[PDB]
Amino acid sequence: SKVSVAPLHLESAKEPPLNTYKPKEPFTATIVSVESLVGPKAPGETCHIVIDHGGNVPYWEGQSYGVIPPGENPKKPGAPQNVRLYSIASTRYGDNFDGRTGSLCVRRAVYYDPETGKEDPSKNGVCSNFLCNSKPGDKIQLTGPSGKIMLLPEEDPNATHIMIATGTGVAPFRGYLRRMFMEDVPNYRFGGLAWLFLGVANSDSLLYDEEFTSYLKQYPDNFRYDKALSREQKNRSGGKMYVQDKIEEYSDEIFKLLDGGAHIYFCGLKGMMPGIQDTLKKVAERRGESWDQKLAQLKKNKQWHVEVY
Ligand SMILES: Cc1cc2nc3c(=O)[nH]c(=O)nc-3n(C[C@H](O)[C@H](O)[C@H](O)COP(=O)(O)OP(=O)(O)OC[C@H]3O[C@@H](n4cnc5c(N)ncnc54)[C@H](O)[C@@H]3O)c2cc1C
């Protein structure tokens, strides 16, 4: 049974909001909560941040918020810090189902000397640590929203959406899937196939796993979910198990879905992409197809959606 969301006037806009707040005059939002998403064996912390924007900074699923961390820009004296962008991990209604909050999925960027292993906090990532160090009531300078690459194509409510994430790249897909399955959105009744592939380092590094597993039990004919755990699993050619390796386990199903018009999405750190391309090229070759020609047609058909960073 789908969760009631409000206010339904968030469905009325026909275009996504863009640059509602700009860096020189951000919106001062308020932290609701910060929690770690990961267990003790995870190589680093990733946190879920809930931000009260008061309904002043609405967005569509797949967009990003900008955050301006405090302090001076180290490269421009007297100037504010540069915006850092974060894929929004919530639906437009947010985790409180009220249209007032949005959420981020933030990996702490921590510096370690490559030899001594000693941490150096002075070289840690500024905005990511600022966010994961935040507490209820803290203020955040919010900009945006921005981005259109990862908007969800809703013209066909029975479309197929193949979602390929590593790490924090799961963020837009958390939003897609809540809109598809969790929330009572009368004007978007999804009856297609949503297929999430997620690569992380180990079980303790999984993000939102209980939520995704719940969809398998609630929507077994509309949702599929496959995981790759790089430090705990090995591919058939015995490298570490990466998200491209799990795609290959479903080579024929995936290529048939693409040929049938499926959308495919990639999100996360950009290092995930060269290997995914290598696997797709090899899968195509085994089928007697040219991956170059296939990718050109997927791009021409607007089926190929990549936001990596
Ligand atoms: C569209 C988009 C969406 C994104 N979505 C997400 C998301 O959902 N989640 C997420 O976590 N990130 C996301 N990012 C990345 C995010 O914008 C930031 O780049 C990231 O959080 C790091 O920012 P920071 O301020 O913490 O690090 P910065 O302060 O910008 O530092 C960058 C890196 O340099 C390192 N560093 C700094 N000084 C030194 C030094 N002297 N020597 C060596 N190393 C040094 C830091 O440790 C860090 O790793 C996204 C990016 C884009 C473009």
Author numbering: 1009 to 1317
Task: Quote the study's own text.
FNR is a flavoenzyme that contains a noncovalently bound flavin adenine dinucleotide (FAD) as a prosthetic group. It catalyzes redox reactions between Fd and NAD(P)H. The redox-active component is the isoalloxazine ring of FAD, which undergoes transitions among three states: fully oxidized (FAD), semiquinone (; partially reduced) and hydroquinone (FADH2; fully reduced). In root plastids, which lack PS I, R-FNR reduces nonphotosynthetic Fd by oxidizing NADPH from the oxidative pentose phosphate pathway.
Previous X-ray structural studies of oxidized FNR have not accounted for the potential partial reduction caused by X-ray irradiation. To limit the reduction rate to less than 10%, it was necessary to keep the X-ray dose below 0.11 MGy. Consequently, X-ray diffraction data for wtFNRoxi crystals were collected using multiple irradiation points within a single crystal to minimize the dose. The absorbed dose during the diffraction experiment was calculated using RADDOSE-3D and estimated to be 0.097 MGy, meeting the required threshold. The X-ray structures of wild-type FNR in oxidized and reduced states were refined to 1.15 and 1.10 Å resolution, respectively, revealing no large structural changes in the main-chain backbones. The root-mean-square deviation (r.m.s.d.) of Cα atoms (residues 9–317) between wtFNRoxi and wtFNRred was 0.121 Å, indicating minimal structural differences at the backbone level. However, the Fo(wtFNRoxi) − Fo(wtFNRred) difference map revealed subtle but significant changes localized around the FAD/FADH2 moiety, highlighting the structural impact of FAD reduction.
